Ligand binder design. Sequence first.
Ligand SMILES: CSC[C@H]1O[C@@H](n2cnc3c(N)ncnc32)[C@H](O)[C@@H]1O
Lengths: 310, 625
Amino acid sequence: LPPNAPACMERQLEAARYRSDGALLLGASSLSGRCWAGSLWLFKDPCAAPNEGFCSAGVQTEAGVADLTWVGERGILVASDSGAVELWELDENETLIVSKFCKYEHDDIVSTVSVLSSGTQAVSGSKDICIKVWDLAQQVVLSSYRAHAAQVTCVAASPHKDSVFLSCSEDNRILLWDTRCPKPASQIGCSAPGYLPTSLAWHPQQSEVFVFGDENGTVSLVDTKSTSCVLSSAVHSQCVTGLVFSPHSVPFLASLSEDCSLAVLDSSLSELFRSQAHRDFVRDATWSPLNHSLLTTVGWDHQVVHHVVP
Amino acid sequence: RVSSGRDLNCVPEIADTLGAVAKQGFDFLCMPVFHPRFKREFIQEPAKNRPGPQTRSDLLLSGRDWNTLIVGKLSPWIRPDSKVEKIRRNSEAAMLQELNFGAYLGLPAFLLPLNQEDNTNLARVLTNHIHTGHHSSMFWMRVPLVAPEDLRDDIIENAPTTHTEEYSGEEKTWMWWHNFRTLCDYSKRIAVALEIGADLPSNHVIDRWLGEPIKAAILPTSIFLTNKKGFPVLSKMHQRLIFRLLKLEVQFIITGTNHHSEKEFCSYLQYLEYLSQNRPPPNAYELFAKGYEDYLQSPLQPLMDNLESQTYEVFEKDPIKYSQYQQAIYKCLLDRVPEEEKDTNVQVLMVLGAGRGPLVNASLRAAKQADRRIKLYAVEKNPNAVVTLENWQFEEWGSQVTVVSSDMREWVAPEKADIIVSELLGSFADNELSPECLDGAQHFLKDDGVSIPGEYTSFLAPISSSKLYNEVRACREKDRDPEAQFEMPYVVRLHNFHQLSAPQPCFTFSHPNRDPMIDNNRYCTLEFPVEVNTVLHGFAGYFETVLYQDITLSIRPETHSPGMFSWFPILFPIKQPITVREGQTICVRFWRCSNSKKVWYEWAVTAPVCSAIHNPTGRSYTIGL
Ligand SMILES: CSC[C@H]1O[C@@H](n2cnc3c(N)ncnc32)[C@H](O)[C@@H]1O
């Protein structure tokens, strides 16, 4: 067990993010029992996770972790139950994880965070209905947007455009943001109102195409250009919680749902692979940078599963 | 001063959190009873078999703390009106689970959101909880003044915000509340936690909430300004709304993080205490009327019943009121006896309904003031009060005062009267049968005699109060008509209500009444122009009386006699609330009806819609003759 590392990891695994070198960022909350808090873990050996005694580094958070993102190779940006966006920094030796900043800007749970392509800026979304843009170096809020009319489910920064990001809300709006526009937000999606949007992922190559998941288990492919719903599949029997693209030239799409299932789809949104491995909600998926055939999922069942995709 | 709670959606340790909020000066904590992010599955394998515990232990606080310090919150993922069947089924199950846990804990209150227009299934589930065992705990419906869709920043290029004004649209949040509470059939356990925003709406939107059952006001840290010294403060407009809510004695809830991080969260609370301590102090009336707010009482019938000693005591505890009576008699004596005839001319003054003698004393102080001469008859049918009178006359008044133990309609007077004086008026003037009593007595008034009072007039005004509607409704009793409550008047210090139109005169009586044929029956049609959207629940009643010339008494607010805490208004309820749209007229009809045995009122609303005639043939309510 490393120094400053908790003896026990909270049961509810919220996030799993591979770094470039193939080390594994883990986020967990305690969602029941006496104490409702969270932890951040680094596993330089991913096969050891989630066992705390084989972790490279661990720390305890004041509160649960709703969302997580790597900031470069040593930075961890945290969406907390506390309404705080937290910046955590890895050690020189990467032996311990130390809090850079903890800012209480959101008036309710911080549900979602994404680092903008700049790498010096992030967007947070909250149950307080607000979306905030952060200056990470100065540790401040540049802008706060009350665009939506209900809790913000997801924010996803454009891969390569530092001023562009997507947001989706229970107000049933998908918003495309450009901070360079005086009215920075633009409402997008299929014409007809559909089921509530629950998850967003930009295509890693095509700058104007993204996928969204819905509360009804439908995954949909959208071109901002056409601003029309090109392709939809009914992949899940429950809400689509996460959408992750493979690092492949022509990327595979990992689909995760409260139906406790993982799905892998082609670019035609057809189903290549499905895993019923988890026996509770599947929270995250991260493809290995090392072996692109490898997909790691975490769930509230506290399973760290390593998938081999055909 | 101010009862205030902290609202949190994050509670790492319940012990520490509770300790912290107490140290800050908060009376109570609103918090989740389950983890807000802990979505639970009730139907689908395998998540259905998720190992517990499903939440933290009841052992973590004392029963006293759970009972007094904690308001529960519905988890935000729970959407019983979702259009997705699976989400609806899971949300129905989760809602019951959370409400059942609250009742398990003995929580004094539980917060539920109205954050959209359709809460039909939410109402159905809550109604089911309420009808599953009889309990006391309150449900606080968290409703915004301004819907979040109407609060959003105008930053969507292709979805601009409509800055065009829509009267009824700006009141949509009230309709969300109305529909919910109508579906839940006006449960007394369902109240409003009104959530206030940075941008207050038009006054009409705020006025919509006037007689509604508001238990809490939620103040986000967001709406507070920063003073020069960096303390949180509020705009004057927010302040004036706070003063309105302090009159309704609501509980204030602070929600959101510390946006004044140069100061502790007690700074928010201290500002509220600052406002409460600096509220424009009340009036003596408001001090008199302190415990009686919206308390329903039976109108006194001092003809049919013999009033108790302490009742006369309160009648007597109004020195301003008898100063008026003294003044009227003073004036009347001087008009009736020129200074040349002062010592030769002794006027016969008869007090009809003398109770324990306050009018006798006023009559005597008047005659010394006028320096004129008076013989007094003190007539009183209540033999209990005659004891008080006869001790008074033996010890103090002497033979100047003849106490008569008799009904003024039966009494054979040894001589005719110059001036009859009476105190026979209820909150609706003629509702204690002053007209019949004085009509009965007028044969023994000299042809040129004066009655004090000479005239009285009843006034009515349509009111909105969902609270008083519910209080009336709660007055169902065994062994009578299950709707009789609605067909009778109540004396009440009207507090949580909205007057929908200026008061209009209803019935008028004059004394003496020289009508060759006298008829005390009445039929009156009133038209109340209404300039608001609202719901009619009943009619406030008031009166004015002319003692003599310009000396009057009034509980009509526009003309209220100052200091006269003597007399709360009366309320005529209706069985079914009536929607009134801005610009519409309320038409009400009132009848004063009689036999040899009884007098009663009947009433009906005929516009914009018709009610049933209330109290037909006095079947629910009569005044004994
Ligand atoms: C001082 S409140 C009015 C008083 O008038 C008395 N009263 C009411 N009606 C009559 C009546 N018809 N004859 C005599 N006293 C009356 C009541 O008993 C009460 O004390």
